[PDB]
Amino acid sequence: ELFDVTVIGGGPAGLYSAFYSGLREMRTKIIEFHPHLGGKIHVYPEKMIWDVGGLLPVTGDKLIEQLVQQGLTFKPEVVLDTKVESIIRNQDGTFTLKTSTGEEHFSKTVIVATGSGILKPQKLSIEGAERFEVSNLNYTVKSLKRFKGKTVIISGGGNSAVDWANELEPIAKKVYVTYRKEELSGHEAQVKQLMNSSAECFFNTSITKLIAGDNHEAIEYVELTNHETGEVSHLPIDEVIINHGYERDITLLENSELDVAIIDNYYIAGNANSESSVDGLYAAGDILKHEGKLHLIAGAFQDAGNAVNKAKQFIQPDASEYGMVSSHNEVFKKRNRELIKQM
Amino acid sequence: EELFDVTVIGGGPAGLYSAFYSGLREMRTKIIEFHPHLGGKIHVYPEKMIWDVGGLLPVTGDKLIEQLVQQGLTFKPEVVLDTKVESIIRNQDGTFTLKTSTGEEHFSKTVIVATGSGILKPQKLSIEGAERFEVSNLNYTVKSLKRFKGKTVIISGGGNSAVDWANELEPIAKKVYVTYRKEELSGHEAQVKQLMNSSAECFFNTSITKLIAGDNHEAIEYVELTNHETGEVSHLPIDEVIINHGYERDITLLENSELDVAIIDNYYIAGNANSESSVDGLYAAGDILKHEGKLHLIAGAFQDAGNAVNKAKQFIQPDASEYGMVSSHNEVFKKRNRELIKQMMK
Numbered sequence: 001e002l003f004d005v006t007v008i009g010g011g012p013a014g015l016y017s018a019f020y021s022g023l024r025e026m027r028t029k030i031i032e033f034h035p036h037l038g039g040k041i042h043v044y045p046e047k048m049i050w051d052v053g054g055l056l057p058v059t060g061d062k063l064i065e066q067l068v069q070q071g072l073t074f075k076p077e078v079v080l081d082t083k084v085e086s087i088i089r090n091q092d093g094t095f096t097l098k099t100s101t102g103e104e105h106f107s108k109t110v111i112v113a114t115g116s117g118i119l120k121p122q123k124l125s126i127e128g129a130e131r132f133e134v135s136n137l138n139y140t141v142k143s144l145k146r147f148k149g150k151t152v153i154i155s156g157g158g159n160s161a162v163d164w165a166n167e168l169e170p171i172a173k174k175v176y177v178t179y180r181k182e183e184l185s186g187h188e189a190q191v192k193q194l195m196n197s198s199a200e201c202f203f204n205t206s207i208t209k210l211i212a213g214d215n216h217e218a219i220e221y222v223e224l225t226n227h228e229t230g231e232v233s234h235l236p237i238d239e240v241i242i243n244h245g246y247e248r249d250i251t252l253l254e255n256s257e258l259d260v261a262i263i264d265n266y267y268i269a270g271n272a273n274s275e276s277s278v279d280g281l282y283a284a285g286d287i288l289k290h291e292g293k294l295h296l297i298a299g300a301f302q303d304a305g306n307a308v309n310k311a312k313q314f315i316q317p318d319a320s321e322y323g324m325v326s327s328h329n330e331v332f333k334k335r336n337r338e339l340i341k342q343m
Numbered sequence: 344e345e346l347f348d349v350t351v352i353g354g355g356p357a358g359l360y361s362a363f364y365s366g367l368r369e370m371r372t373k374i375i376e377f378h379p380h381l382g383g384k385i386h387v388y389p390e391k392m393i394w395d396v397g398g399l400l401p402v403t404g405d406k407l408i409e410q411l412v413q414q415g416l417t418f419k420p421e422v423v424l425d426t427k428v429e430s431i432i433r434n435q436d437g438t439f440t441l442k443t444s445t446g447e448e449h450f451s452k453t454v455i456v457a458t459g460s461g462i463l464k465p466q467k468l469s470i471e472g473a474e475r476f477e478v479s480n481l482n483y484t485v486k487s488l489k490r491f492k493g494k495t496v497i498i499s500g501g502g503n504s505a506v507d508w509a510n511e512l513e514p515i516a517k518k519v520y521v522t523y524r525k526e527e528l529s530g531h532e533a534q535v536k537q538l539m540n541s542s543a544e545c546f547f548n549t550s551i552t553k554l555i556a557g558d559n560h561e562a563i564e565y566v567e568l569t570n571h572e573t574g575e576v577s578h579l580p581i582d583e584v585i586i587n588h589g590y591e592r593d594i595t596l597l598e599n600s601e602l603d604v605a606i607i608d609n610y611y612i613a614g615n616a617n618s619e620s621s622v623d624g625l626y627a628a629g630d631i632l633k634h635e636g637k638l639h640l641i642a643g644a645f646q647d648a649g650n651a652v653n654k655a656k657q658f659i660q661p662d663a664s665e666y667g668m669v670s671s672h673n674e675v676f677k678k679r680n681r682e683l684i685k686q687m688m689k
């Protein structure tokens with residue numbers, strides 16, 4: 001089970017890597033920590049994205065869909081819910097990847113596309129809270145439309161919370177914010193927009209229980225307790241959003257034995273073709289640093305394409321330097337046939 | 344003055360995204376293109392399906408052009424069409440003057456060269472007054488496959504491109520004729536074998552010698568064929584005529600310029616990984632840019648363009664940030680987004 005190309009990470013860079021790897025006819029695997037492909041766009045799926053080349057403005061949610069679909073065009077082996085723990089370069093020059101459960105994967109080449117690492121939202125510490133993640137307890141704003149005309153309480157006071165409140169005020173029926181401190185630890189320019197308009201803020205307050213109402217499995221009321229007086233208010237709500245920050249895991253390369261050059265203790269020091277200091281090991285997306293790195297989704301595509309063209313030649317030296325342009329690539333002939341049936 | 348921040352030469356993918364991103368970073372932006380339509384080399388393949396633009400599900404070149412043009416015009420740059428830029432002059436203060444073929448002049452703090460492989464023009468039919476029918480059914484590209492559904496088309500020429508057109512139209516058209524001036528179908532001897540096992544009928548040592556219009560409409564109804572080795576003069580009823588005799592190419596822009604601009608292999612601008620040329624304030628993006636990490640795709644044009652724009656902004660405003668603000672949080676979209684979000688809420 002030795003793969004041609006194994007992509008670590010399922011964001012824009014990893015997904016396009018898998019795509020272009022399949023366009024160049026390589027046995028391809030993609031390994032992602034979360035149960036869902038898409039990467040960091042999951043942090044802002046409600047926002048409008050204008051700066052992807054060739055795309056008219058689209059929401060994060062819709063962009064994730066289009067990238068996942070393109071990334072799976074050639075049916076790579078998809079390994080979700082898996083944290084890659086370490087990368088080993090074997091003596092024969094192939095690579096072995098160890099997962100958190102000790103399972104192992106083997107590859108001729110590895111494309112590191114871990115972006116800024118593993119992100120996990122800090123969870124609400126109340127007993128049966130995770131029961132409501134399947135209904136109306138959220139850790140992101142999945143879409144603005146989800147909250148049209150609904151009553152929403154945001155727990156937390158970061159810049160993310162102030163941002164969420166400000167975009168939801170025009171849309172929700174009502175917006176509540178509860179912060180456990182006495183001052184909104186946000187930016188003192190967008191904090192006043194929040195305060196001159198519709199949002200109602202509670203300070204030194206937190207959520208202490210989630211009431212599901214008689215017959216349903218979704219939150220209807222929220223118990224609020226004040227930390228300076230002591231009141232135990234109750235509040236009817238349609239939606240709850242927790243913004244208590246994020247937990248980060250960047251240990252992948254520290255846990256590995258590879259003389260891979262690192263910039264600023266995190267980023268892979270690459271060149272303009274996405275090569276690292278280790279043969280057959282490439283870097284694409286936010287994990288990649290070089291003088292020409294473009295810190296946009298559009299840059300991730302360039303990083304990925306360069307990585308794959310190099311991987312192809314590493315594996316097959318007589319391969320051409322570049323992939324066949326898709327309009328004339330025979331690899332799409334069968335698929336194009338079905339689509340052409342559009343008359 | 345009429346002094347622009349960024350003037351883009353070339354309206355293809357690289358130029359259009361440059362214009363967009365230049366607007367994203369709040370610079371006075373102008374874009375100059377030779378043809379009457381923006382879009383670049385994609386007008387050579389508008390019927391093909393394009394799969395490898397990042398984030399894009401397969402779409403025809405026709406639709407991609409539409410999408411690229413709308414994005415490139417987001418911030419309403421000054422668009423100068425039907426205009427050939429003849430030379431680039433670096434003025435004594437380090438600004439630039441661009442001279443068009445009619446002598447007009449444009450001025451800019453920075454210049455982004457996005458001319459691809461240059462100005463491309465189809466080789467026209469050497470027949471009197473043929474241009475009359477360009478408005479009707481005399482085509483120099485396959486603008487779409489559906490345009491030829493169940494129709495009768497003759498293709499003149501026999502190169503790899505002519506063989507490719509016939510091959511994609513044979514399953515779609517009622518009937519495909521190919522007429523070639525040579526003895527052999529001088530394409531590539533692989534897909535040439537697909538053409539002659541299929542329903543496409545070839546006429547060798549033949550060329551089109553006159554076009555015959557209909558009487559009650561002014562398309563072409565009959566084509567006069569002349570076999571050049573016998574002498575026969577056939578006539579042939581058709582719905583569509585497609586010419587493919589090659590292209591004319593105009594690459595003189597940089598030869599005609601007095602710029603100390605390093606050139607690779609007599610054509611490409613020798614850039615670095617940030618799309619900089621050897622001349623301060625002159626950038627290159629797209630197929631015209633060569634450096635060790637240049638990606639020869641539409642996807643690569645976008646990175647060349649963003650990198651070029653970020654550099655132009657710092658050249659013009661040294662304290663500007665090295666990076667543009669991501670669109671999702673960039674205040675320059677706020678009023679536009681408000682209108683979009685309103686539509687989204689039913």
Ligand SMILES: Cc1cc2nc3c(=O)[nH]c(=O)nc-3n(C[C@H](O)[C@H](O)[C@H](O)COP(=O)(O)OP(=O)(O)OC[C@H]3O[C@@H](n4cnc5c(N)ncnc54)[C@H](O)[C@@H]3O)c2cc1C
Nearest residue numbers: 009011012013033039040084114115285286296297670671
């Ligand atoms: C708020 C915000 C807004 C942005 N907006 C824009 C915008 O409008 N336009 C734009 O062009 N760019 C934008 N970006 C820039 C950024 O490039 C993209 O957001 C994108 O996420 C980068 O893609 P990437 O694949 O390289 O990294 P990521 O998207 O971070 O993908 C990395 C993936 O790898 C996984 N992973 C990491 N480590 C491991 C491991 N050890 N094992 C398994 N899986 C692992 C992670 O779970 C994640 O899914 C924005 C960034 C932010 C933070």
Ligand SMILES: Cc1cc2nc3c(=O)[nH]c(=O)nc-3n(C[C@H](O)[C@H](O)[C@H](O)COP(=O)(O)OP(=O)(O)OC[C@H]3O[C@@H](n4cnc5c(N)ncnc54)[C@H](O)[C@@H]3O)c2cc1C
Nearest residue numbers: 327353355356357377383384428458459461629630640641
């Ligand atoms: C047949 C074919 C298929 C392709 N398929 C794909 C594909 O499927 N996917 C992919 O990613 N890439 C593909 N490409 C690759 C190529 O990058 C794109 O086609 C694209 O055209 C390059 O963008 P560009 O803006 O830099 O240059 P161009 O598209 O060539 O645009 C340059 C523009 O500048 C104008 N111009 C030039 N000189 C002047 C001047 N002096 N004054 C004024 N205007 C001027 C020209 O008129 C033209 O409009 C393909 C290329 C070809 C030939």
